Amino acid sequence: TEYKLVVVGADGVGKSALTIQLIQNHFVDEYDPTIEDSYRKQVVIDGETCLLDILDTAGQQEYSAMRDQYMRTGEGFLCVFAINNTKSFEDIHHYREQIKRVKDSEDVPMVLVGNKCDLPSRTVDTKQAQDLARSYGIPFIETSAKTRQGVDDAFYTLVREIRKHKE
Numbered sequence: 512t513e514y515k516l517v518v519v520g521a522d523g524v525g526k527s528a529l530t531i532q533l534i535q536n537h538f539v540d541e542y543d544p545t546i547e548d549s550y551r552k553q554v555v556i557d558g559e560t561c562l563l564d565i566l567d568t569a570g571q572q573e574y575s576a577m578r579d580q581y582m583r584t585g586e587g588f589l590c591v592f593a594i595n596n597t598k599s600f601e602d603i604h605h606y607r608e609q610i611k612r613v614k615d616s617e618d619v620p621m622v623l624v625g626n627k628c629d630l631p632s633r634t635v636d637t638k639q640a641q642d643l644a645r646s647y648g649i650p651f652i653e654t655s656a657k658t659r660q661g662v663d664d665a666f667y668t669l670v671r672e673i674r675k676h677k678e
């Protein structure tokens with residue numbers, strides 16, 4: 512049983528760091544912001560062993576058959592902003608609209624992720640994101656790629672969203 516996951520959001524929010532933290536269980540200081548790649552890992556989620564197939568997006572212009580394939584056949588999306596980055600939060604709607612158009616549906620499994628919670632300089636409050644998440648009817652999860660806080664929860668919640676959708 513496989514789950515095909517796509518991580519989207521503005522550049523610099525932590526899409527790469529979150530993916531690598533899940534896959535390789537370390538925090539990456541620098542990862543080329545223009546590199547888009549997929550990552551696979553066998554995980555156990557609520558006692559069910561599955562394969563996660565995750566595309567870490569970089570939003571480049573060059574055609575990628577893989578990118579298209581993941582957008583078309585992708586089962587769930589992580590929409591990521593950073594809590595210290597107001598612009599990244601404002602951009603969330605763009606990503607949501609993109610996803611809805613790709614999937615031609617309102618009911619796409621999706622989790623709103625507020626990354627960099629380890630930082631004190633918060634400009635996007637919890638209530639704001641909760642309200643947005645509620646508006647979309649999707650779960651919101653606070654994360655830190657840096658400390659691993661909520662990293663499993665974010666990806667695992669999305670899988671649970673996918674399972675719900677499956678019936």
Ligand SMILES: Nc1nc2c(ncn2[C@@H]2O[C@H](COP(=O)(O)OP(=O)(O)O)[C@@H](O)[C@H]2O)c(=O)[nH]1
Nearest residue numbers: 522523524525526527528539540627655656657
């Ligand atoms: N403090 C902090 N820095 C983070 C966190 N996640 C990522 N970063 C840093 O934010 C920058 C951008 O991260 P990256 O994973 O390349 O973002 P992407 O452009 O969305 O792929 C890098 O300098 C990371 O080290 C986090 O949870 N906390």
Ligand SMILES: [Mg+2]
Nearest residue numbers: 526527543544
């Ligand atoms: Mg990246």
